[PDB]
Amino acid sequence: GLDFPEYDGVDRVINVNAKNYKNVFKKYEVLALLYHEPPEDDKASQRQFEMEELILELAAQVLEDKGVGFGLVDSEKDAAVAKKLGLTEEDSIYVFKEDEVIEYDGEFSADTLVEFLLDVLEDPVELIEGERELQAFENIEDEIKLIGYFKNKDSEHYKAFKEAAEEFHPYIPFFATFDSKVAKKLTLKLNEIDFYEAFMEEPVTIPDKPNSEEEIVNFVEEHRRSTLRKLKPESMYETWEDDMDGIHIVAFAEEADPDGYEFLEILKSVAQDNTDNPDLSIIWIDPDDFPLLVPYWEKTFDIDLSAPQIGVVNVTDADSVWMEPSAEELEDWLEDVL
Template sequence: MHLSWQLLEDPVEIINSKLELQAFDQIDEEIKLIGYFKGEDSEPLPLGETLGLKMNEVDFYEPFMDEPVHIPDKPYTEEELVEFVKEHKRATLRKLRPEDMFETWEDDMEGIHIVAFAEEDDPDGFEFLEILKQVARDNTDNPDLSIVWIDPDDFPLLITYWEKTFKIDLFRPQIGVVNVTDVSSMCLENPAIPRLG
């Protein structure tokens, strides 16, 4: 089952095959919930066991996380699930997307975020992003950590603005700290970050 905050499509999907399970696993940049339920008409499928789920259990996945959080206190009502997701929706690592770019900056971190620019399709950017994902996985329980990943390819009209504002070159991965409450920033020069050219 996949719940999405954007209700452009049906937010609940029934996973009935290994192929559908693989498609679920490919969802990496969004929050996802998966539950294992059996109705009277259901045929037994080992997919729940494959996921490590027990009957009537729901797991919550933060974006970019491999390991889920088991939602406690089953059985669940829809309101309880929605409340749990609302309480846990601020992920450690988030990708800035055009459809939710303003919401991404407005959280309870007093406006301070680690911001990383990396092109996912670029080999150096991909490696840098994998390091960011590992840092997020290792620190997912730290409520004071907020990493915002920006793929410049998603915002072609903002590349020049960001380069001038932050005094950076977006043809290579970059990382820095941004305080959105007073619009201050500091980009880090790190020789360990792969550089092009």
């Protein structure tokens, strides 16, 4: 009776250094690097480091037959490897998929890291050919998505789109179609790129068609903050550090709970009415995606996370106010505390 697969105890995470680094880069397809401060002499410090290495050791085993290497570049001792690579953010992971660098903005857990890298392994523009890929695109809602329509893979404007997708890969989905039947369904004229905001049904089309790469990348950096964003594990620190000037409006709702989902609907209707407003960002957190954190959110905030919640929290003091409702009722309580 054969069982499931466990951690074997074998070390696979590499000590990338001055001797090393050139050869680790040519041995792997995509390579993941924890650029890090050395372990400070005390126990607490070394156990936090003990942990990070062992989470990367798990990701290593799992992603071994797929060509993802993992490495540690020490900030003081491999300082020259850091300089010559573009390793500037201190205890963070950096991913090298064929020369160009992806920064990892999320959760330090073997779970989200492996999903991130699997997404990294994929092609940056995902194609639409026939209605079963179109009604896949149509259903994405929790993220910004762009879609474009071109002549074929050779179109000068599609190479522009595809290079813009690379700069946002894997975090923002870029789709393309060369079928005029999908373009008819989707509105699209030739070389038109429509941008869809997270949780919006209505798209803004990128203006001076046909768009160059720089034009598409200016557009997307200019429209990254959606009105309703979702705290996602692979992004969690990118969305948290984009506070609307010291403040965050945070809504907890379990999308699975009947009551959580109903509140999610109201909240989606609040964002759709004030999306013309730029200062706003409502961050929605589904407690269910962050199990280890909901006892922290429950005693800090002094809320029951079994219920849908809506608050405003001071991004610095961790200080907050929570509401004790309709869209218009949710709006008004937001007017009175802000």
